Design a binder for this molecule. Structure first.
Ligand SMILES: [Zn+2]
Ligand SMILES: [Zn+2]
Ligand SMILES: [Zn+2]
Ligand SMILES: [Zn+2]
Ligand SMILES: [Zn+2]
Lengths: 75, 488, 84, 61, 149, 151, 60, 450, 103
C-alpha cells in the first residue's frame, strides 16, 4: 500500500566535500559526516546540509564514533 | 558571522541549564543552550542591540534569586530569564561601559556599581524587571486634584517636549503645565510649575508652528472662541512662558485640529476650514464643505501634506486630496459600513488604521484601481475635468447614487475586536531597535497593546497553526474525554 | 400549509424570548423603541461604553449614568426630567 | 472475533475470509447485509493489503 | 458623444468595433444592434465616446473598411511601411502601436487574413522618423518587425 | 398621502424615490432609510409576475466552463461530458472490473489547488452594491474588462 | 451584520406587504443571532426619529 | 497557600471583564498573589459563594450565557483557575433579555439568583456532594419590567428572599416600584410577596439584617427610606449635605452601602455621589415603643466606590470606580449615636443638616493603594527605543511615565580619571570576616585599585 | 425536525439533565439532524424529565434512549444550541400514518 495521492551503509566513507578520508570528523543534528575543514567551509556559502538541505545552524559535534566505525576495531 | 568580541558562560540554578552568552562585534548578541554531558550547541537565540562590539558582564539578583548578564553597547541590555522565558531589555541609564555587583550598607539588594560611558564611577540599584506578567513599570492622607486632565501635546520640532492641559471641575478654568526632558519647568520666575488660564476651558487644543522659528498654542473654548497663545522657553533658566495673542470666533465646537502645511487644519462640525496666521486674529485661508453624509468630524489625520483622512461620528471614514490651485479638498474614497471612529491614522499612504466607540480596531486599504489613477493624474482633475473612469464604475454611480458617490470604496483589510475603546494609536518606526515597525495603541480603561506586522508568509502560517491549536483546545480535551469514557 | 403554520408558532415563541422581532406590520413607533432599548442596553453593558458616556456627560458617578440609561428605557423619563 | 483478536494470528486467515464474503453481499435480507458490511469495512480499516485491488472494486459495485 | 456607425458586415463584432474606435479616444460603451431573438446583427452599431471631441474626431477620421465593407459613420440621431506582422495584428492593433509617435493606416489582408504588413501615414515626417528606429526591429507579438520609409 | 414632489424635497438623493414610495404606511421614514448612506435597494423583480427567473435570457445560457487553472489538470480530455455500452457489457464490468480509468496524476492535482493556483482568484467577482438582475449577463462584462486592458 | 444589513434595511418597511413580508423574515433571523451586534448599524438619525439617543453623539 | 493548614476569610479576588486577579490581606497590606490566564470573554458578574460543608469558589457569569462556578486551585507549580460547573443560559452576546449583569447569592450558599434587564430572572439552587451540583433553574418572567438594583436579603435559613427596583417599560408615566420575591423551598418556586410603588427617583436597595419581615434601605435622590415588606414601617431620613455645593450640583443619591455588624452593633456604611460616607444604625426607640429609629451621621469620606467590602478583620476595602483602589482599617468607628448635634433621626423626616467635609481623614487609615489607570484619555509616546509613554492620572492629576525598561536608580557617582575600560570586584581576602571588598579598574596603560 | 414539518419542539429553559438518543437515532444532532462533528451535550428541561418520558429518544420520543445527544459544530456556531429544550413532543404525521396502514 503506497499512496501517491497524499547492513545498509548510509555512511559514505570518502567525503562529500573532500571526497577523501574523514579527518577531524564532524557530526550534525543529522547523521551527516564531514571533516572539521569540510563543514566550516560549507557554511561560508550554504545555510544547510550539503545533502539534506536541512538546518545545521553551524552545529557540529566531534564525530569520534566515526573514527570508531572507521577503525577496524570500532570503539 | 563576524568575529566574537566577547563571551561568558553561566549556569542558572533553577533549570540547571548551562548557557553560553556570546557577544559579537557589530552589535549582534547571541546565547546558547549547552548540553552538560555531550557539549552540544542548541537553542540559538540572537538579537541586535545597538551598533558597537558588545562586551558582556554578569550579576546576581532577585525581582526569588536570579542571575542576568547585562550587555554594553550604545545602550545597556540586561538579558535575564524569568521562569522558562528569557527577555532582553534595556535600562533607563543611557549606557554603562562595565558593570559589577556591589553589596553595602546603606542596605543593598540588587545594588550594582558600574562605570558610565563618560568614564565615571557610580552606584545604582536595579529595581523593576519587565516580566511578561507586568512588562511596563510605572514611574513619576488622601490625594485628590480638582483639575481633571484633558489633553497632551508635543512640540513638532522639539522631538519630545510634552505639554499638558487640564480643566477645572467647577468654575471654568484651565491649567497648563509643560515638561521638557525629565522634569517639568517653572513658570517664568514664579514658584509655580504651572500656569492657570481663567475663563478658558479647552474642548480641544493643538500646538502649531505657523513659522519655523516659533511655536503657538491653540485652544477652543466651549464659548465658540478660538484662542492662540505663544510658547516661550527661556533656555536656559529654564522656564516656560505662555503669551496671549488673539481671540477668534467660530461656529462649531472644533473637536479636531492639526498641522497641515503652514496652517491649522481645523474641523468644524460639518466642514473643514484651513487657517493661517494673521495679525489681530487668525483668518480663513480655505474652506471645504463636506459630502452630505458627514455630520461631525471626530478626528482627522494626514499623510505628508498630500492627503487627509477624516473620520465621522457615525459614518465611517473618508480620504481627501489637497488640491492647490483649487484651494480645496476633493474626496476620492469612502467606506462601506457604518463605523464610529474615535481615532484614525495612516500606517501608509494608501492605508489607514482606526478604532470604534465599540471596541473594534480595523485597517482600511484603498483599492489599487484607485491607486493607478491617483498615481497617473494631477489632483485638479478629480473635481471637474477629464478622468477616464471604466465603464462599470460610472454605472454604479447611476445605479446607486447614495452608496458609491465618491466613487471607490476601501477594501477592509484587518478587523479585530478588543473590548476597550482605543484612544490613541502610535505608529512607531521600530521598538527597541526591532526591525518590524509596530503600532502601539492605548485604550480608555487603561491598556497598551500592539499590532505588529508579521513579515514572512512563513510565520503567519505557523502562528496561524498555533492559534488554531489553542483556540479549540477545550473542545479537543473534551472529545478525548468523551471517547475515552466510551471505550477504556 | 402545515409548514407555514409551524412558522407562526415559532414566531410567537421567539418574540417572547427576544422581545423585539418585527413581523410584517410593525408600527414605526413600535420598531423605533426596540432600536432605542438595545442601544441603551449596550451603552450601559460594556464597561468602556459606560465610562465614555459618563465622562462625556460629566456625570458625578459612573453609577448614576447607568441609571440615567435604564430610566430612559421608560417612555415617561422625558416627562420626569422636565418636572424636576 | 476479528476486531478483538490480532489479524496476523487469525486462523482462517483473512485473505481467505474476504473473498468468501463478497458473494454474501448479494444475499438480500438485512441481517446479512448489515452484519456483512460492518465486517467488510472492518477489513478495509485493519487489513487493506490482503485482497487485491480488483477485489475491492468488486465490492464497490 | 454618440455615433451611429452602419453598413457593417453582419459578422463585425463589438470587440472589433472597440479595437477600431478605441484609438480615437476612451470609449464609454459600444452596442451592435441585433435581432431580439435570432440575434442576427442589424448591420449597424452605436459607439459611445467619453469625450465628444473624440466622437467627433472618430467621425472625421475613421469614416474605413471592416470585413469587406465601408462603414458609414454619422452622429446618432510621412508614410512608413511595416513588415512581418503577427497576423493577430489588425488595423486597430496597428494604430494603437504607432499612434504614440504622433497623428497618423491599413494592415493589408487577403482571404487568408492579416497578410503580414501594412502602412501608416503620419501627418508629420518627424513623427515617421521617430516611428522608424524606435520600432524597426524590436519584437511585437513574438515577431520582429521591419519599419522603413 | 404626500405627493412625490413633496417627498422628494426631504431627501438628499431625490433620484431614488419613486411613485410607489408615496403609499408606504410610513413614507417619511422609508424615504429617509432608503436614502441612508449605504442602503442598497430591494431587488427590482418584485411586481413582476414572471417568477424572477423566466426564460428569454435563460434559453441561451452556456453549460459551464472550468476555470483555466483547473483545465490545466487535463480532466477535460479524460472524461468528455459534452454532449455506448450495451447493458450486457456494463454488467460484465461490475464483475471483472477494470482499473485505472482516469490515469490522472496525483501530484499535478494537488499543485493546481495549492502550489501553482495558490493565489488564483476569479477575474471579476462582484462589488458591494451589484445585485444580479434577471437579464444581466456576466460573460460580456468580464470580457469587456479583458478587452479594454489588452486594447 | 453590518455589511449584510445594508441589503436588508430598505425593504424592511416598503409599501408592498409582500416585499415587506419577505425582508422581515430575514431581519428576524438576524436579530436573534445578533441583538447587541446590530446596535452600531441601525439607520437612525436625530431627525429620522423623535427621541433618538442624545448620548450617541457625545465626544470626549 | 504556603500553609499546610490555614483558613482565614481575608483574601480577595478582583475581576474586570476579561482580566482577573487575586490579592491577599492579613499582612496589613494588599499583596498580589496570582494573575491568571487570559479569559477571552466578558465577565458580567462575580460573587463568591461560600457553601456549607471546603474552599470558596467564585461563581462567575459572563458573556456566553453560561453560569460558571470556578474554583481557583493549585496545580503544577502555579495557581490555575479551574472550572466546575458551567450551566447554559440563552445566547452569546451581552443582550438585554439574557440573565446576567445582576447576580446575587444567598448569603449562606443555598442558591444563586440571576436576572436580566427586562423579561426573565432565574434562580439556581446549589448543593454540595461528592461533586458540586446545581438544581434545574427556577424561573419567573415579568414581561415589560426593566430591572435596576437586585440587592438581596440575608435570612437565617428561613427561605431566601430578594428585593428589586423594577420600572415598567411600557407605561404613560415613569413609576419605579420596589418588589420583594421569596423563593419557597417547600413548594419550590419563586413567589412575589410584596409590591410597593415608590417615587420615581429611586436609585438603589440595600438589605438590613435582622432587627432582633425584612427591611430594606432605599436610596432616593436627596433622602433615604427604609421599608418593611409588610408595609408597616416607612421611615424617611433626609440625607445630609455639603456646605459649599460647588457649581453643578446634582440632587445627590447613594451609590454603595455595605452592612457590617458585630456585637449587637448594627451599623451600615452608605456612601453618596460626592464620595461622602455615612453610617446608619437602627435603634429600638425605647420611649415610643420598640420600633425603629434611623440615623444618618458622617464618616471620613473617600473617592467614589463602585462597591465596598469589609473583612472579618477591621480592614475595609473600597473598590474605586475612576481609579486607584484602596484598603482602609477603621479605628474610630464613627460618631456615637448620642449626639443630637450632628445626627439625624427618623423622628421627623423633614429637617436638614449641613456639614463641612473633613480632609483630615480621621476615622479611616490608608494602609494600602493599588495604582490603576482607569481612564486614560490621551497619551504620548516619548523615547521610542525604550518605549516610554507619557500620560496623566485622572483623579490625582499627576504625570505618569510608563516605560518598558529596567528601572536603574543612581546614587553617589564619583569622578574617575580618564579612559577606563573594564571593572572587577572581589570580596576582600585581607580582612576575613569583614565587609571590605576590593574594587579594581583598568586603563589601557594603567591599572587602579580601591 | 429539519425535514418533518409537523413536529413541535419544546423550547423551554434547559435544565441540568442530558437528552438521550435511541440506538437508531444515535449520532444525530437534534436540530439539523446531521451525523457529523459533535460539539456540546444537549440539555433538556425538567418538564421533559419526570417518569417514563425522560428515557425516550429526544427525537422520536418513542424508543428508549441510551447515548447522550450532542449539538453539531455548525449548530453551535449559529447559536441554535441555546434556543431551548430541543425535544420533540408530538409523534408526527409520518410515524402515525405508517403505523395505521401496517395495522
Ligand atoms: Zn573532508
Ligand atoms: Zn542533513
Ligand atoms: Zn430516536
Ligand atoms: Zn446541527
Ligand atoms: Zn422540554
Amino acid at each position: 500500500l503506497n499512496q501517491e495521492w497524499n547492513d545498509l551503509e548510509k555512511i559514505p566513507f570518502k567525503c562529500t566535500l573532500c571526497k577523501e578520508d574523514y579527518k577531524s570528523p564532524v557530526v550534525t543534528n543529522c547523521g551527516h559526516y564531514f571533516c572539521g575543514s569540510c563543514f566550516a567551509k560549507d557554511m561560508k556559502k550554504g545555510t544547510k546540509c550539503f545533502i539534506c538541505h536541512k538546518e545545521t545552524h553551524g552545529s557540529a559535534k566531534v564525530a569520534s564514533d566515526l573514527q570508531k566505525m572507521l577503525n577496524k576495531r570500532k570503539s | 558571522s563576524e568575529k566574537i568580541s566577547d563571551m561568558i558562560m553561566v549556569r542558572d540554578s533553577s533549570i540547571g541549564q548551562l548557557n553560553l552568552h556570546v557577544g559579537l562585534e557589530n552589535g549582534v548578541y547571541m546565547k546558547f543552550h549547552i548540553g552538560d554531558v555531550d557539549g552540544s550547541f542548541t537553542d540559538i537565540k540572537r538579537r541586535f542591540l545597538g551598533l558597537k562590539p558588545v562586551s558582556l558582564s554578569y550579576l546576581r539578583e532577585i525581582s526569588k534569586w536570579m542571575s542576568c548578564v547585562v550587555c554594553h553597547s550604545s545602550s545597556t541590555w540586561v538579558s535575564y530569564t524569568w521562569k522558562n522565558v528569557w527577555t532582553i531589555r534595556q535600562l533607563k541609564d543611557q549606557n554603562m561601559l562595565s558593570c559589577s555587583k556591589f553589596v553595602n550598607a546603606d542596605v543593598a539588594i540588587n545594588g550594582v556599581c558600574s562605570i558610565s560611558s563618560s568614564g565615571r564611577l557610580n552606584i545604582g540599584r536595579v529595581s523593576n524587571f519587565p516580566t511578561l506578567d507586568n512588562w511596563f513599570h510605572v514611574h513619576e492622607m488622601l490625594q485628590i486634584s480638582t483639575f481633571r486632565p484633558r489633553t497632551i501635546l508635543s512640540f513638532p520640532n522639539n522631538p519630545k517636549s510634552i505639554l499638558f492641559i487640564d480643566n477645572h471641575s467647577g468654575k471654568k478654568q484651565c491649567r497648563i503645565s509643560l515638561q521638557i526632558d525629565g522634569e517639568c519647568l517653572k513658570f517664568g520666575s514664579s514658584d509655580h510649575l504651572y500656569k492657570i488660564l481663567d475663563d478658558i476651558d479647552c474642548v480641544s487644543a493643538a500646538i502649531i508652528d505657523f513659522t519655523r522659528q516659533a511655536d503657538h498654542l491653540i485652544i477652543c473654548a466651549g464659548d465658540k472662541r478660538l484662542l492662540t497663545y505663544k510658547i516661550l522657553v527661556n533656555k536656559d533658566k529654564l522656564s516656560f512662558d505662555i503669551e496671549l495673542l488673539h481671540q477668534t470666533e467660530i461656529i462649531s465646537p472644533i473637536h479636531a485640529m492639526l498641522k497641515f502645511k503652514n496652517f491649522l487644519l481645523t474641523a468644524m462640525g460639518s466642514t473643514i476650514v484651513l487657517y493661517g496666521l494673521g495679525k489681530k486674529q487668525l483668518l480663513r485661508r480655505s474652506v471645504t464643505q463636506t459630502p452630505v453624509s458627514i455630520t461631525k468630524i471626530v478626528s482627522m489625520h494626514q499623510w505628508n501634506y498630500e492627503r487627509l483622512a477624516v473620520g465621522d461620528i457615525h459614518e465611517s471614514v473618508t480620504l481627501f486630496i489637497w488640491d492647490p490651485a483649487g484651494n480645496v479638498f476633493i474626496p476620492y474614497v469612502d467606506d462601506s459600513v457604518k463605523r464610529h471612529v474615535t481615532v484614525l491614522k495612516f500606517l501608509d499612504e494608501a492605508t489607514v488604521i482606526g478604532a470604534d466607540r465599540y471596541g473594534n480596531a480595523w485597517t482600511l486599504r484603498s483599492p489599487p484601481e484607485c491607486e493607478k489613477i491617483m498615481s497617473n493624474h494631477d489632483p485638479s482633475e478629480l473635481s471637474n475635468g477629464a478622468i477616464k473612469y471604466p465603464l462599470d464604475v460610472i454605472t454604479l454611480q447611476q445605479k446607486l447614487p447614495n452608496t458609491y458617490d465618491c466613487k471607490f470604496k476601501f477594501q477592509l483589510l484587518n478587523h479585530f475586536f478588543v473590548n476597550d475603546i482605543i484612544t490613541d494609536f502610535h505608529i512607531l518606526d521600530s521598538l527597541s531597535n526591532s526591525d518590524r515597525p509596530g503600532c502601539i495603541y492605548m485604550g480608555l480603561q487603561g491598556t497598551v497593546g500592539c499590532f505588529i506586522p508579521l513579515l514572512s508568509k512563513g510565520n503567519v502560517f505557523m502562528m496561524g497553526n498555533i492559534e488554531n491549536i489553542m483556540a479549540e483546545a477545550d473542545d479537543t480535551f473534551y472529545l478525548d474525554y468523551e471517547s475515552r469514557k466510551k471505550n477504556n | 400549509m402545515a409548514e407555514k403554520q409551524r412558522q407562526l408558532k415559532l414566531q410567537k415563541i421567539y418574540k417572547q424570548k427576544y422581545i423585539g422581532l418585527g413581523d410584517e406590520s410593525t408600527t414605526r413607533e413600535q420598531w423605533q423603541r426596540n432600536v432605542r432599548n438595545d442601544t441603551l442596553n449596550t451603552l450601559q453593558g460594556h464597561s468602556a461604553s459606560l465610562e465614555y458616556v459618563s465622562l462625556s456627560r460629566g456625570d458625578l458617578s459612573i453609577r448614576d449614568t447607568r441609571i440615567h440609561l435604564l430610566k430612559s428605557m421608560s417612555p415617561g423619563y422625558k416627562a420626569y426630567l422636565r418636572e424636576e | 472475533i476479528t476486531s478483538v483478536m490480532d489479524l496476523d494470528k487469525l486462523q482462517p486467515p483473512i485473505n481467505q475470509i474476504l473473498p468468501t464474503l463478497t458473494p454474501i453481499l448479494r444475499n438480500k435480507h438485512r441481517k446479512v447485509e448489515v452484519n456483512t458490511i460492518k465486517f467488510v469495512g472492518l477489513i478495509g480499516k485493519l487489513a487493506p493489503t490482503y485482497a487485491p485491488p480488483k477485489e475491492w472494486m468488486r465490492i464497490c459495485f | 458623444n454618440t455615433v451611429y456607425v452602419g453598413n457593417i458586415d453582419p459578422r463585425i463584432t463589438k470587440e472589433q468595433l472597440y479595437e477600431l474606435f478605441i484609438q480615437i479616444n476612451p470609449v464609454l460603451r459600444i452596442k451592435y444592434p441585433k435581432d431580439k431573438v435570432l440575434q442576427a446583427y442589424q448591420g449597424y452599431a452605436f459607439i459611445e465616446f467619453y469625450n465628444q471631441g473624440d466622437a467627433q474626431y472618430a467621425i472625421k477620421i475613421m469614416n474605413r473598411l471592416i470585413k469587406v465593407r465601408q462603414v458609414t459613420n454619422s452622429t446618432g440621431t510621412a508614410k512608413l511601411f511595416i513588415k512581418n506582422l503577427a497576423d493577430s495584428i489588425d488595423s486597430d492593433q496597428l494604430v494603437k502601436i504607432f499612434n504614440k509617435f504622433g497623428k497618423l493606416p491599413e494592415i493589408f489582408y487577403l482571404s487568408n487574413g492579416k497578410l503580414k504588413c501594412a502602412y501608416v501615414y503620419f501627418e508629420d515626417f518627424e513623427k515617421a522618423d521617430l516611428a522608424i528606429k524606435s520600432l524597426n526591429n524590436q519584437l511585437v507579438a513574438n515577431n520582429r518587425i521591419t519599419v522603413d520609409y | 398621502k404626500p405627493s412625490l414632489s413633496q417627498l422628494k424635497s426631504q431627501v438628499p438623493y431625490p433620484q431614488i424615490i419613486e411613485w410607489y414610495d408615496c403609499d408606504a404606511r410610513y413614507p417619511g421614514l422609508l424615504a429617509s432609510i432608503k436614502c441612508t448612506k449605504n442602503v442598497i435597494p430591494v431587488p427590482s423583480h418584485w411586481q413582476s409576475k414572471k417568477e424572477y427567473l423566466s426564460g428569454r435570457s435563460l434559453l441561451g445560457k452556456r453549460p459551464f466552463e472550468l476555470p483555466d487553472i483547473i483545465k490545466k489538470t487535463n480532466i477535460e480530455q479524460m472524461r468528455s461530458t459534452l454532449p455506448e455500452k450495451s447493458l450486457k457489457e456494463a454488467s460484465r464490468a461490475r464483475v471483472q472490473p477494470k482499473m485505472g480509468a482516469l490515469d490522472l496524476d496525483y501530484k499535478k492535482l494537488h499543485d493546481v489547488f495549492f502550489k501553482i493556483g495558490a493565489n488564483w482568484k476569479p477575474d471579476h467577482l462582484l462589488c458591494f452594491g451589484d445585485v444580479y438582475y434577471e437579464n444581466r449577463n456576466l460573460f460580456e462584462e468580464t470580457n469587456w474588462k479583458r478587452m479594454v486592458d489588452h486594447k | 451584520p453590518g455589511l449584510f444589513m445594508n441589503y436588508i434595511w430598505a425593504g424592511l418597511f416598503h409599501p408592498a406587504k409582500n416585499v415587506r413580508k419577505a425582508f422581515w423574515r430575514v431581519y428576524n433571523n438576524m436579530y436573534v443571532m445578533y441583538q447587541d451586534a446590530m446596535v452600531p448599524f441601525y439607520p437612525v438619525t436625530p431627525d429620522n426619529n423623535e427621541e433618538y439617543i442624545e448620548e450617541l453623539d457625545l465626544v470626549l | 497557600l504556603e500553609a499546610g493548614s490555614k483558613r482565614e476569610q481575608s483574601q480577595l479576588c478582583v475581576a474586570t471583564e476579561t482580566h482577573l486577579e487575586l490579592y491577599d490581606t492579613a499582612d496589613g497590606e494588599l499583596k498580589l498573589i496570582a494573575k491568571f490566564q487570559n479569559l477571552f470573554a466578558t465577565i458580567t458578574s462575580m460573587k463568591s459563594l461560600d457553601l456549607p460543608h471546603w474552599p470558596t469558589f467564585l461563581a462567575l457569569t459572563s458573556d456566553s450565557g453560561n453560569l460558571s462556578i470556578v474554583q481557583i486551585i493549585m496545580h503544577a507549580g502555579a495557581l490555575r483557575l479551574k472550572t466546575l460547573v458551567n450551566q447554559p443560559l440563552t445566547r452569546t452576546t451581552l443582550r438585554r433579555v439574557s440573565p446576567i449583569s445582576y447576580m446575587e447569592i444567598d448569603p449562606n450558599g443555598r442558591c444563586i439568583i440571576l436576572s436580566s434587564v427586562e423579561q426573565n430572572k432565574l434562580c439556581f439552587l446549589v448543593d454540595y456532594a461528592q461533586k458540586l451540583r446545581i438544581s434545574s433553574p427556577l424561573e419567573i418572567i415579568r414581561p415589560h419590567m426593566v430591572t435596576l438594583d437586585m440587592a438581596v436579603v440575608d435570612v437565617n435559613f428561613n427561605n431566601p428572599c430578594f428585593v428589586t427596583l423594577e420600572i415598567d417599560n411600557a407605561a404613560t408615566q415613569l413609576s419605579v416600584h420596589l418588589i420583594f420575591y421569596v423563593l419557597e423551598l417547600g413548594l419550590n418556586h419563586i413567589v412575589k410577596k410584596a409590591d410597593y410603588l415608590v417615587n420615581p427617583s429611586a436609585n438603589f436597595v440595600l438589605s438590613l439584617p435582622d432587627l432582633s419581615n425584612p427591611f430594606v434601605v432605599i436610596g432616593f435622590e436627596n433622602h433615604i427610606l427604609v421599608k418593611d415588606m409588610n408595609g408597616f414601617f416607612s421611615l424617611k431620613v433626609e440625607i445630609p449635605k455639603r456646605s459649599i455645593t460647588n457649581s453643578r450640583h446634582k440632587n445627590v443619591t447613594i451609590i454603595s452601602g455595605i452592612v457590617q455588624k458585630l456585637k449587637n452593633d448594627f451599623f451600615v456604611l452608605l456612601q453618596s455621589n460626592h464620595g461622602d460616607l455615612f453610617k446608619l444604625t437602627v435603634s429600638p426607640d425605647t420611649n415610643d415603643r420598640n420600633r425603629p429609629l434611623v440615623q444618618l451621621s458622617y464618616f471620613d469620606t473617600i473617592q467614589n466606590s463602585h462597591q465596598l467590602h469589609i473583612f472579618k478583620n477591621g480592614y475595609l476595602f473600597a473598590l474605586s470606580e475612576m481609579n486607584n483602589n484602596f484598603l482602609f482599617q477603621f479605628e474610630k468607628l464613627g460618631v456615637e449615636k448620642n449626639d443630637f448635634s450632628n445626627v439625624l433621626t427618623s423622628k421627623d423626616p423633614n429637617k436638614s443638616l449641613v456639614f463641612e467635609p473633613s480632609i483630615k481623614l480621621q476615622n479611616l487609615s490608608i494602609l494600602s493603594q493599588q495604582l490603576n489607570l482607569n481612564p486614560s484619555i490621551k497619551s504620548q509616546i516619548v523615547s521610542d527605543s525604550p518605549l516610554s509613554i507619557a500620560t496623566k492620572h485622572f483623579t490625582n492629576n499627576k504625570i505618569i511615565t510608563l516605560t518598558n525598561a529596567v528601572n536603574y536608580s543612581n546614587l553617589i557617582s564619583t569622578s574617575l580619571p580618564p579612559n577606563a575600560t573594564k571593572l572587577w570586584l572581589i570580596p576582600d581576602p585581607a580582612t576575613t570576616g569583614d565587609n571590605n571588598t576590593l574594587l579594581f579598574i583598568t586603563f589601557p596603560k594603567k591599572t587602579m585599585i580601591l | 425536525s429539519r425535514h418533518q414539518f409537523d413536529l413541535i419542539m419544546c423550547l423551554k429553559q434547559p435544565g441540568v439533565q442530558t437528552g438521550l438518543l435511541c440506538e437508531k437515532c444515535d449520532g444525530k444532532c437534534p436540530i439539523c439532524d446531521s451525523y457529523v462533528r459533535p460539539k456540546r451535550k444537549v440539555r433538556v428541561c425538567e418538564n421533559c424529565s419526570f417518569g417514563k418520558q425522560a428515557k425516550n429518544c429526544i427525537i422520536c420520543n418513542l424508543n428508549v434512549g441510551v447515548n447522550d445527544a450532542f449539538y453539531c459544530w455548525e449548530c453551535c456556531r449559529l447559536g441554535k444550541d441555546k434556543d431551548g429544550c430541543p425535544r420533540i413532543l408530538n409523534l408526527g404525521s409520518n410515524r402515525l400514518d405508517r403505523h395505521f396502514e401496517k395495522k
